[PDB]
Backbone as a ProteinNet text record, in pm:
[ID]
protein_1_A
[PRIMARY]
XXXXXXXXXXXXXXXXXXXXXXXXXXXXXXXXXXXXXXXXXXXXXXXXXXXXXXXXXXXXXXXXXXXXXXXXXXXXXXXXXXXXXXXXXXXXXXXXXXXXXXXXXXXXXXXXXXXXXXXXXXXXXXXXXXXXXXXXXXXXXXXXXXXXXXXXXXXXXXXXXXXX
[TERTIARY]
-10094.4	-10164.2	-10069.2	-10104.9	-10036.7	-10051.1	-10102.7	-10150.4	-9992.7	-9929	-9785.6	-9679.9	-9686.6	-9602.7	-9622.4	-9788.5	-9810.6	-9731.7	-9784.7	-9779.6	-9616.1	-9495.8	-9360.5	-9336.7	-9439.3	-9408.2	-9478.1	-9552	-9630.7	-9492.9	-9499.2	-9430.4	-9235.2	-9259.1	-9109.3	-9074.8	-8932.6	-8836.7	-8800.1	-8828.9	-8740.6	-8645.1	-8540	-8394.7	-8451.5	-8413.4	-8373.5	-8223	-8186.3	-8077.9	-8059.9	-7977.6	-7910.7	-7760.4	-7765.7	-7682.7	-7604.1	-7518.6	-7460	-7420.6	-7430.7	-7432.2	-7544.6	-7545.1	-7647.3	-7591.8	-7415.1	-7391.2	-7397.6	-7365.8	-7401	-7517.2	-7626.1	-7777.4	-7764.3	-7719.6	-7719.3	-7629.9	-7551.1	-7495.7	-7531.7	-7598	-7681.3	-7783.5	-7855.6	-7968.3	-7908.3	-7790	-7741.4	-7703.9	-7627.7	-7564.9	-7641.7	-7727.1	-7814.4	-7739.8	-7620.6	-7568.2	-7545.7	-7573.8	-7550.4	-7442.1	-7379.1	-7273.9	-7284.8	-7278.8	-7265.6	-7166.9	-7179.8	-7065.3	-7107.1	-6967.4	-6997.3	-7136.5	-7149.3	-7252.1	-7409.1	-7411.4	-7508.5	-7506	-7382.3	-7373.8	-7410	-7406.2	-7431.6	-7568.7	-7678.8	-7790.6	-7835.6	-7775.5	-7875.1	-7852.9	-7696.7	-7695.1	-7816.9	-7812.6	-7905.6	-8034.1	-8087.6	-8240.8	-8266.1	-8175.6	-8220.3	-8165.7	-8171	-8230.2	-8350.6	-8381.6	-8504.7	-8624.6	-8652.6	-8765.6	-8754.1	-8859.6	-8891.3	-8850.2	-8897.3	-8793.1	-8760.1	-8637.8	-8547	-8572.7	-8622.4	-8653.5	-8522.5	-8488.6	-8367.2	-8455.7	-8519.7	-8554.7	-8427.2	-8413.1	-8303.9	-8349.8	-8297.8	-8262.2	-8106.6	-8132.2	-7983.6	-8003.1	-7884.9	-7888.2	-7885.4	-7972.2	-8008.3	-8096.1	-8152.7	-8254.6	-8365.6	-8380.9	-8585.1	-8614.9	-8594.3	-8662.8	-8620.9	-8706.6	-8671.4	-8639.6	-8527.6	-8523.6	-8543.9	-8631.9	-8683.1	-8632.2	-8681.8	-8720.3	-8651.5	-8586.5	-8535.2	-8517.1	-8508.9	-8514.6	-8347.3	-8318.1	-8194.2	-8202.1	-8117.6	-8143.4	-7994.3	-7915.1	-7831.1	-7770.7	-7702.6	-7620.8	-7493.6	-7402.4	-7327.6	-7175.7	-7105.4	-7015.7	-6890.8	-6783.8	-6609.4	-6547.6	-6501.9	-6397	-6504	-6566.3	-6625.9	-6631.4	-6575.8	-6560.8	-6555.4	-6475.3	-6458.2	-6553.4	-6675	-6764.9	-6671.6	-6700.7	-6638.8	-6746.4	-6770.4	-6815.3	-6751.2	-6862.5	-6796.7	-6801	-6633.5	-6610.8	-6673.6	-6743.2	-6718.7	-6588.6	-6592.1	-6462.6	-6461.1	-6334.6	-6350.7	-6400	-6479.1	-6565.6	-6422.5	-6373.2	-6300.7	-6374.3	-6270.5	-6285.1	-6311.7	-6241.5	-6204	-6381.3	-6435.9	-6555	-6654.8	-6676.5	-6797.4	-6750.9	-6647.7	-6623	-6720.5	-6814.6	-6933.2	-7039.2	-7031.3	-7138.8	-7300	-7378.7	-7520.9	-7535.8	-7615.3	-7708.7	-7846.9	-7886.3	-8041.7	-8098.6	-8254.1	-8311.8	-8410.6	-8379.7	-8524.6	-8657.2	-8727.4	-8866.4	-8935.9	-8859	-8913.2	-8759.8	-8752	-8709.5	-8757.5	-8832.4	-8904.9	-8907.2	-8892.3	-8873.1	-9020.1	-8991.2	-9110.7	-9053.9	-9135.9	-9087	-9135.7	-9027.3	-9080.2	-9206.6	-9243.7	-9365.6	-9508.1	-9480.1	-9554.4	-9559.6	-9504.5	-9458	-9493.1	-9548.7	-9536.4	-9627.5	-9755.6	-9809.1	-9813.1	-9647.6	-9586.1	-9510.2	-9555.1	-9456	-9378.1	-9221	-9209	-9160	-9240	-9238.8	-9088.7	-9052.9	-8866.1	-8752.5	-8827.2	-8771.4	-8868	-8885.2	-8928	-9070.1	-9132.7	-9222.1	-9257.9	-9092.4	-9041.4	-9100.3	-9083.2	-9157.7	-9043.7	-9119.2	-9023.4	-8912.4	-8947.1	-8788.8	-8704.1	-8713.7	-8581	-8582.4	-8386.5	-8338.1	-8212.1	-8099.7	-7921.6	-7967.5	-7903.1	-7878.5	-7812.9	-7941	-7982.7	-8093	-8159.8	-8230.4	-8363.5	-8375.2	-8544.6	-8630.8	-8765.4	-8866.6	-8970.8	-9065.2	-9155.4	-9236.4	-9314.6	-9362.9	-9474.2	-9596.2	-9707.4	-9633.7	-9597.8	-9511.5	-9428.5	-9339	-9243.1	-9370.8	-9476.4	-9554.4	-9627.5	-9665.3	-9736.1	-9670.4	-9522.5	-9486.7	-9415.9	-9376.9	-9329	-9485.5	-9591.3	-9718.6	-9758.9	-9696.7	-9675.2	-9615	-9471.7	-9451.3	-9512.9	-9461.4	-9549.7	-9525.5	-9569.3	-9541.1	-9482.7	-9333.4	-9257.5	-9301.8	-9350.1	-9418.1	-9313	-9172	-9074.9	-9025.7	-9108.9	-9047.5	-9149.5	-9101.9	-9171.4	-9145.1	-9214.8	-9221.6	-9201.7	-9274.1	-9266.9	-9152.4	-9023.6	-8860.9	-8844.7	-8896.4	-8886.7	-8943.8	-9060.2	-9149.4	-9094.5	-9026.5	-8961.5	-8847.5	-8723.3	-8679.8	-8682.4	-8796.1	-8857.8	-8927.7
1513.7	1418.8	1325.5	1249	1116.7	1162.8	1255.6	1334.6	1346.7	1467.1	1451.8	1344.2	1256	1151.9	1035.9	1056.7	947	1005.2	1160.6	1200.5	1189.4	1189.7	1168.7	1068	943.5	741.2	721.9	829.4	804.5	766.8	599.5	568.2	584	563.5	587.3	426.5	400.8	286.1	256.7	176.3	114.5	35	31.2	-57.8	-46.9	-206	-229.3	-169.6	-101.8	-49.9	-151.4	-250.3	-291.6	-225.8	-217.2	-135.1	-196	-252.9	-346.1	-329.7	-221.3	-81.6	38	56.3	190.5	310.3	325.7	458	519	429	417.4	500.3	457.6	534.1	664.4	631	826.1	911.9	843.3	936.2	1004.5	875.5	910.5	1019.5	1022.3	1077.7	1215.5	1201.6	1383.5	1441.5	1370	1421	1418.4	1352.7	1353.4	1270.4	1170	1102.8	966.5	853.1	743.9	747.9	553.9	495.3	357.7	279.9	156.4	100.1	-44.4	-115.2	-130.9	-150.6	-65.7	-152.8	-267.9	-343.4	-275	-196.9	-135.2	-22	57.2	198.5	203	91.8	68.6	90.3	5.7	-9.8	141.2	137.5	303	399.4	433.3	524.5	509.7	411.3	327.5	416.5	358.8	394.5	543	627.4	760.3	818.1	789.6	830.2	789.1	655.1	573.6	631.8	683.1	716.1	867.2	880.5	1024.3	1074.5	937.2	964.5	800.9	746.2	636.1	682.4	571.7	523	446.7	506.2	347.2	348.1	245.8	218	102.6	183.2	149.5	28.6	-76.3	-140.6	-177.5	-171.8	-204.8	-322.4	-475.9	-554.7	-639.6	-701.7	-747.9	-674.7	-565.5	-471.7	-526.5	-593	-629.7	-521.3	-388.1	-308.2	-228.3	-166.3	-29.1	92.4	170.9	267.1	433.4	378.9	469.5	499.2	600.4	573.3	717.4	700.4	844.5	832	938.8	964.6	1037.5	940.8	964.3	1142.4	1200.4	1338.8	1365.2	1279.7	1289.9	1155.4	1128.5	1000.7	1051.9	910.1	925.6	1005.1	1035	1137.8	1114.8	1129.5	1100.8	1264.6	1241.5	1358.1	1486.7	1446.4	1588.5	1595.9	1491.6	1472.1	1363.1	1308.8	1180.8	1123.8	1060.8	1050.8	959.6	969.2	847.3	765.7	640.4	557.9	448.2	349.7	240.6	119.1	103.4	22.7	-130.3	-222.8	-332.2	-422.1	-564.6	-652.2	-653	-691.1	-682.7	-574.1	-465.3	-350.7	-227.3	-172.3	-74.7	72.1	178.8	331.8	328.6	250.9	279.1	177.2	124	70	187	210	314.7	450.8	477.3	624.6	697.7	659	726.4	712.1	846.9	931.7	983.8	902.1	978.6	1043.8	1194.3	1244.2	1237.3	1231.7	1177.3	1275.2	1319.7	1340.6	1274	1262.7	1212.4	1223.8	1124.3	1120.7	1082.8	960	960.4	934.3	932.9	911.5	832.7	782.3	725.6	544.7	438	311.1	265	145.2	23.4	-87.2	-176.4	-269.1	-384.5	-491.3	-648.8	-647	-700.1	-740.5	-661.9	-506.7	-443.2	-448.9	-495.9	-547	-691.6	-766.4	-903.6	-927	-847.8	-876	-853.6	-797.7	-739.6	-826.7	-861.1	-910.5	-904.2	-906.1	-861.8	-974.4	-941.3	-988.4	-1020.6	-939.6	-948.7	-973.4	-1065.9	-1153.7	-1273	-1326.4	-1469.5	-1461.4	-1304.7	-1310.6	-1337	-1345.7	-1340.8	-1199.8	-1227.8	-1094.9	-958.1	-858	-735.6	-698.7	-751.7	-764.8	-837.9	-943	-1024.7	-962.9	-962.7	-906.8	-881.3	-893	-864.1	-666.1	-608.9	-483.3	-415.3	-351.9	-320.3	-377.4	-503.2	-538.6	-435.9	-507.9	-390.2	-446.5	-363.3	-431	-345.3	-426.2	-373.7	-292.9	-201.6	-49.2	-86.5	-191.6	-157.1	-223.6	-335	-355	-255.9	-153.7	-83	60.9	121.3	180.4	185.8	41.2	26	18.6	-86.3	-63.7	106.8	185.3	301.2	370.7	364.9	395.3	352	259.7	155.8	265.7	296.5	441	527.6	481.7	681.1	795.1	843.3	993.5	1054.1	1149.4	1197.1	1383.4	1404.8	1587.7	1636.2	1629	1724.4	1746	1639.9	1710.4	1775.2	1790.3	1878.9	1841	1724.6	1718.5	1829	1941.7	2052.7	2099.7	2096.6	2097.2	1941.4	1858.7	1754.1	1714.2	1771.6	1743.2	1864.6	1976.5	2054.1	2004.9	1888.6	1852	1740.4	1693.8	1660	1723.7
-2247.4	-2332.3	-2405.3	-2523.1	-2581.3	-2711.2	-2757.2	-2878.6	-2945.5	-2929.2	-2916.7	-2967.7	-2871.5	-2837.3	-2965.3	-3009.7	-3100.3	-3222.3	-3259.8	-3394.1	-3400.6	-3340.8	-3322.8	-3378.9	-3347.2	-3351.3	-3428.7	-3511.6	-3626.3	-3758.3	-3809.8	-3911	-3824.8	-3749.2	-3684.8	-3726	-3679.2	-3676	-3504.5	-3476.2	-3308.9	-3302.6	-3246.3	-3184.6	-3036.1	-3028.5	-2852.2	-2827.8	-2747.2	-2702	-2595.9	-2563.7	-2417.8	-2374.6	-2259.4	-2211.7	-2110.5	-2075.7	-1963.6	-1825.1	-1830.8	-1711.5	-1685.5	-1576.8	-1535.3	-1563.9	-1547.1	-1558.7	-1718.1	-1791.9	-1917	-1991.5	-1941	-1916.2	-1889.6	-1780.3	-1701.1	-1764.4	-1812.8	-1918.6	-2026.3	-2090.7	-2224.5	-2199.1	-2060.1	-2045.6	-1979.5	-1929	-1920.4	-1998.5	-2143.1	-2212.7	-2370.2	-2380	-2475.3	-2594.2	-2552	-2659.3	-2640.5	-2759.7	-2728.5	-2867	-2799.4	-2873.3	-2873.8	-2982.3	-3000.7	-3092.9	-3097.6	-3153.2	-3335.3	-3412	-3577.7	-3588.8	-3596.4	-3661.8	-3619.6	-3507.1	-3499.8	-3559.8	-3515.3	-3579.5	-3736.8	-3785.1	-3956.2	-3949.5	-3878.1	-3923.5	-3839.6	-3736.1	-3732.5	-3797.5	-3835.9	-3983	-4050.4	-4136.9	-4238.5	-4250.8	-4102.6	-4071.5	-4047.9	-3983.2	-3980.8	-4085.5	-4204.1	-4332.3	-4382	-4343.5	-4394.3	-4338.5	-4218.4	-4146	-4093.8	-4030	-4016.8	-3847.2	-3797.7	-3631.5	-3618.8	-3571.6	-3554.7	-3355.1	-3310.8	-3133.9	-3102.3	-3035.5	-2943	-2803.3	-2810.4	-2639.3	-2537.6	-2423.5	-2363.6	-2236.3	-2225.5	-2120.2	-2099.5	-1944.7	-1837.2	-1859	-1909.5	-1857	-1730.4	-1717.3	-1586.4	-1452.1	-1520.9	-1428.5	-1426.2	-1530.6	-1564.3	-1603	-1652.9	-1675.9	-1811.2	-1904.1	-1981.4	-1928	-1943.7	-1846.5	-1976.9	-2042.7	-2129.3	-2284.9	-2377.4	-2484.3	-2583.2	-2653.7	-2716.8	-2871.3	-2915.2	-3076.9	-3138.5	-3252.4	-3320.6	-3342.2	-3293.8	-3343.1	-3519.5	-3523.9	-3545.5	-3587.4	-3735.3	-3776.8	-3669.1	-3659.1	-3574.4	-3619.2	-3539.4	-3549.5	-3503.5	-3558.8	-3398.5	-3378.7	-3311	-3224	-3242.4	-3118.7	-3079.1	-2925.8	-2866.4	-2704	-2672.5	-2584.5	-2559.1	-2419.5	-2467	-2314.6	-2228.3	-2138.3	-2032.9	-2011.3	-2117	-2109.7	-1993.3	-1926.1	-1802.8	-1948.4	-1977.7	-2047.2	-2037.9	-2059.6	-1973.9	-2034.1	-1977.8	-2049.7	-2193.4	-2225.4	-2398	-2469.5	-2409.1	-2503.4	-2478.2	-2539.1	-2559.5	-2641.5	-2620.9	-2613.5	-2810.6	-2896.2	-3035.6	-3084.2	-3042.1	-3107.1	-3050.2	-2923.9	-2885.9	-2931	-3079.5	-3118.3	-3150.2	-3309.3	-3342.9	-3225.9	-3225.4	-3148.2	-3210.7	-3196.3	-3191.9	-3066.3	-3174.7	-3061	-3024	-2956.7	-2892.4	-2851.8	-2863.6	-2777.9	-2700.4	-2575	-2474	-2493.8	-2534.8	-2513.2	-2394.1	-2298.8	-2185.8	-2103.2	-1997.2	-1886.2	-1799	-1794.5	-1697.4	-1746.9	-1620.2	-1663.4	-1628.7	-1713.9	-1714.1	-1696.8	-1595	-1567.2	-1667	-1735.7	-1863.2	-1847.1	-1682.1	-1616.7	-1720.3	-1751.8	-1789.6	-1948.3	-2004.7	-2172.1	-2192.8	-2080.3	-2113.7	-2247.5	-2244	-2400	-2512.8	-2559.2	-2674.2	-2703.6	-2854.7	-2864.1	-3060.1	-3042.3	-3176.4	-3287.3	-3374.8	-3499	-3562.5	-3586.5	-3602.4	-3525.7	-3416.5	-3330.1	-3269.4	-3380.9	-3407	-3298.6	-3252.9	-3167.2	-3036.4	-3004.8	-2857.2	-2797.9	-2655.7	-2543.9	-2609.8	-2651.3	-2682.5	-2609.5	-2454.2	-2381.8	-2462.5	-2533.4	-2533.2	-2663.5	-2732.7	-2800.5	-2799.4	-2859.1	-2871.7	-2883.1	-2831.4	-2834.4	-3006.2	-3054.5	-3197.9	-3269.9	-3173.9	-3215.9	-3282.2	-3389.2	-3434.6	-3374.1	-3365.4	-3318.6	-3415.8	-3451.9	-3573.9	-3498.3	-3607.6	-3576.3	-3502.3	-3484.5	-3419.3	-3273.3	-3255.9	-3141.7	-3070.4	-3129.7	-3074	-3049.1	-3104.3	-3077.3	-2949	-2937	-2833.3	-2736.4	-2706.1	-2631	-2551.2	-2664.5	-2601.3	-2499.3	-2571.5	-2525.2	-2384.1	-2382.6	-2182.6	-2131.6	-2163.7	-2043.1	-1974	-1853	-1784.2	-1855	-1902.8	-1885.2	-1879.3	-1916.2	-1875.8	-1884.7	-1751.9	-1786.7	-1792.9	-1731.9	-1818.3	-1923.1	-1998.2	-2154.6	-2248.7	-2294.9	-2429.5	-2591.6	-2620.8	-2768	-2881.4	-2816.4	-2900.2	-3021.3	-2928	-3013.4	-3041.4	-3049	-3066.9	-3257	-3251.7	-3362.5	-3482	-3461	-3532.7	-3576.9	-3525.9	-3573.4	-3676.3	-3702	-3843.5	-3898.1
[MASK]
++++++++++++++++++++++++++++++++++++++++++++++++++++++++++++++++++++++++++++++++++++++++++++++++++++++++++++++++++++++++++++++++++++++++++++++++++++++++++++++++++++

């Protein structure tokens, strides 16, 4: 059901996550941790104090697609393992240090095509696709859109909703 999934995004916070790479993703989604650059790492500190669950929904640049949707489990952290992030140009090992941990809410992608009638407020009301990576996207917008996802039956909200 969606029962679950809502009461989680009930009063939550959303960031667009862009990601410039795929392996990037698959990382995050094996290892249950993301990393960004300080100016983000500031505002997501920030917010997972402010709210009750903090969303990063993830897109690959240049896929057309969301490749799914996860919750701050954790402010960010250094020296607890060094991921092997796929650097791109200019992005270096000493900006992607603080480490959040995540847990997965979905796995599963959506294609723009399927978002075209979202659109967010705290970006001048552009399609919820477009956005600089950290972008926020306001709560009934970032709601609905996570609500577009399929389904992900392998997970289980259950340990999810205990950690708030």
């Amino acid at each position: 059901g969606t029962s679950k999934l809502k009461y989680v995004l009930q009063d939550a916070r959303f960031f667009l996550i862009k990601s410039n790479n795929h392996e990037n993703v698959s990382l995050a989604k094996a290892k249950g941790v993301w990393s960004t650059l300080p100016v983000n790492e500031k505002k997501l500190n920030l917010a997972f104090r402010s709210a009750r669950s903090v969303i990063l929904i993830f897109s690959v640049r240049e896929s057309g697609k969301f490749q799914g949707f996860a919750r701050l489990s954790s402010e960010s952290h250094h020296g607890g393992s060094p991921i092997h992030w796929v650097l791109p140009a200019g992005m270096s090992a000493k900006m992607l240090g603080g480490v959040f941990k995540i847990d997965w809410i979905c796995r599963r992608e959506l294609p723009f095509t399927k978002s075209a009638h979202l659109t967010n407020p705290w970006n001048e009301h552009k399609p919820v696709k477009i956005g600089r990576d950290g972008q926020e996207i306001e709560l009934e917008c970032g709601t609905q859109l996570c609500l577009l996802f399929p389904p992900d039956e392998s997970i289980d909200l259950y340990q999810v909703i205990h950690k708030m």
